[PDB]
Amino acid sequence: ISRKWEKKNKIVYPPQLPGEPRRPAEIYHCRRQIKYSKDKMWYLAKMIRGMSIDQALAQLEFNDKKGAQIIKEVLLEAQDMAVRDHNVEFRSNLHIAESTSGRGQCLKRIRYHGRGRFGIMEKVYCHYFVKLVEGPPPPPEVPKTAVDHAKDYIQQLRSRTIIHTL
């Protein structure tokens, strides 16, 4: 057990100078001991990464997976504790900066078998962490153009040196 994602929500930064850029807000929320697999939960967490909170609260609602409702709840708690206790002006000015699922404490039980034999069953739990950062979703990755691809090849050749000699 180690609950550090809970403490990070309490960090206090020093006041800014009159012309410093306005620091974007960060929120740290999670839920523990969820009756779900961490491997199954990752697909839901991976999906929402890099999206807004009104664009991640829509994709989740129409997913059949059980975890979709669980994540949606902690994406609404995060969306409320940001506006009330972290000074976020607009509900629609957030985006999921990070989101991942972690292993929890499990329980060991006996799964019976057919010849007086058995195997060890584990009832699986997990945790799920999310960070929300105030600001529109960073623009997506732009694929390298053909010109950019060609430039790297030339740059690679330009770096060539005469090896193993003065």
Binding site: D54, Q55, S92
Partner: protein
Amino acid sequence: SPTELTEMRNDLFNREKSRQLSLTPRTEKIEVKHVGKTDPGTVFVMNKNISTPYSCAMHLSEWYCSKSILALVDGQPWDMYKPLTKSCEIKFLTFKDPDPKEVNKAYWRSCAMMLGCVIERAFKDDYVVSLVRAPEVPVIAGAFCYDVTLDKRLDEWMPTKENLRSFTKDAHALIYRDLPFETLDVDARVALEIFQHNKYKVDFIEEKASQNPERIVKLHRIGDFIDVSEGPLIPRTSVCFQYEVSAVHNLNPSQPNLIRRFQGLSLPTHLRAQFTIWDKLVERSRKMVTED
């Protein structure tokens, strides 16, 4: 030089905005209530002369920001980015509303304004391009028409198909840039200074100032381009997805000064049209449509 004209107008626009903002000291909270069907009864406390209808959408959800084009302040259409002034009621109008009359006109004027910007900067510096006005035509007209006067040296030259294609590429470039429209209310005295060179613009400014009891005028800036606006416009250029300058027709009764009517079509991202439907509408726009 035309570059000088843009700079001075731009500077004048900035000064007018700066005084208006400086003119308003402190923050005074104003009550505005949501009157729309869905999410009814919400009440926003906003900053007077600073808050915008876009901010009201931001509180509610991202859907309103993405799908809202105009807002009805106390039964009057107001630009989404135009700052609020006093306590009122706010209703957001999407394209797909049952009564989109106001939305259609806002989009209509908007597209023809972007058309005007393309034309002036499309020509070569050697020739002279002056913008007279665009007549208000019903959407049923089948295209939006901007009238542009041209230098006498061009009276014998009519743009070819390649020239028409070039304009759309510039228009699409403006759309891709995604430049928000800037909404400013300007008194006639300042407005005349910004457009003193253009006699037709001066005359249009006089008409607008005369209509209202005061000398208030509506000025819209699309990036560098600055022009008077008949009505509230779309918040952003990216709202347009399909764009096309159908054709340009010389006005027959233009003995004193030759004027060419520049007619085009555009459809927003919301109401996209299939390829076949787009072509038929494009063909209709090529027909010259008069103003009733």
